[PDB]
Amino acid sequence: SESTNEFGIFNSLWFSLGAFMQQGCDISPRSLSGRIVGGVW
Amino acid sequence: RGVQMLLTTVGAFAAFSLMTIAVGTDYWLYSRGVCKEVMTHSGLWRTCCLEGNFKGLCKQIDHFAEYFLRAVRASSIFPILSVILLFMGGLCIAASEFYKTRHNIILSAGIFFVSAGLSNIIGIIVYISANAGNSYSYGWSFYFGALSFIIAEMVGVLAVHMFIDRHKQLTG
Numbered sequence: 001s002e003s004t005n006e007f008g009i010f011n012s013l014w015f016s017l018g019a020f021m022q023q024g025c026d027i028s029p030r031s032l033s034g035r036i037v038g039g040v041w
Numbered sequence: 042r043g044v045q046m047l048l049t050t051v052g053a054f055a056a057f058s059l060m061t062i063a064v065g066t067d068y069w070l071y072s073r074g075v076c077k078e079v080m081t082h083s084g085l086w087r088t089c090c091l092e093g094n095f096k097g098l099c100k101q102i103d104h105f106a107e108y109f110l111r112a113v114r115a116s117s118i119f120p121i122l123s124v125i126l127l128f129m130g131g132l133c134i135a136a137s138e139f140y141k142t143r144h145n146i147i148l149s150a151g152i153f154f155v156s157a158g159l160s161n162i163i164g165i166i167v168y169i170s171a172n173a174g175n176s177y178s179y180g181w182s183f184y185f186g187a188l189s190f191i192i193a194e195m196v197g198v199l200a201v202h203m204f205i206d207r208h209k210q211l212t213g
Contacts, residue, residue, distance in 0.1 A: 001213025002205070009198055 007034065016041070042206055049199040053131050053154075056192040059185055060127065064120050067099070068180040070172060076100050082180060083172075085117050114171040119164030120186075126157040127193060134200075144211075147204040154197035161190045 007015070007029060018025040019041060029035050063069075067084030074081030079093035089099035104115050113119075130153030133146070140146055165186070 002209060009201075 005030070045199070045203060049196065049203055050134050050137075052192045052195050052199075053127060053134070056189045056196075057124070057127050057131060059192075060120070060124050060189040063182040063186045063189075064117075064124070066182050068182045069168075070180050070183075071178050110167065110171070113167055117164075117168070119160050119167070123157040123160035123164065126153045126160065129153050130157070130196070142207070144204065144208055147200060147207070151197055151200040151204075154193060154200060158190055158193050158197070161186065161193075 007027070011027065015025045015028065015038070019038060028038060064085065067082050067087060067089050069085065070083040072081060072083060073079065074083070074088050074090065076088075076090040076095040076098040079090050079095060081088045081090050087099050087101050090096060104111055130150050133150035133153065136146055
């Protein structure tokens with residue numbers, strides 16, 4: 001049931017590395033509390 | 042799920058025992074200074090002379106717009122806050138031999154492990170930018186606090202890793 005979403009620890013790491021260099025990543029958060037951190041970082 | 046029940050607790054104990062050392066030891070920064078221009082090893086509240094006749098003598102340092110940042114440096118508040126937060130995280134996990142299966146008993150810890158970490162960020166950045174006000178070099182208590190942060194970033198993850206499967210057992 002947790003697979004209703006997937007931004008686990010490793011994916012929540014990988015998002016950051018690609019975000020740090022503009023190349024981005026294969027997923028990005030849907031919900032606001034997730035989006036806002038990208039929207040700042 | 043298993044041996045992690047106990048082993049995940051351990052790192053907080055070291056991180057907390059380390060963190061108090063930086064608040065008192067006068068080994069943040071090496072520079073020249075005065076105990077009346079000889080070398081000095083520098084603390085939060087005071088500095089102490091060495092390589093001269095004043096070796097082992099100390100005197101206070103004091104500083105009473107960036108007026109509020111000045112006050113934040115003069116109080117050096119953030120270490121105390123992060124220490125309290127991490128200790129309350131430990132107090133959250135310290136219960137877990139009783140009141141088991143509440144789920145809240147585990148879930149409540151993560152906030153402290155996050156917040157102490159973030160608190161250290163501001164503490165560092167304020168302290169560095171203020172004291173920057175040249176061959177200077179950072180004393181070991183800086184590394185102690187960084188290491189405390191490094192371990193503190195573990196248990197926030199481990200708290201979720203412990204919690205989540207027991208909520209899953211109620212939710213699928």
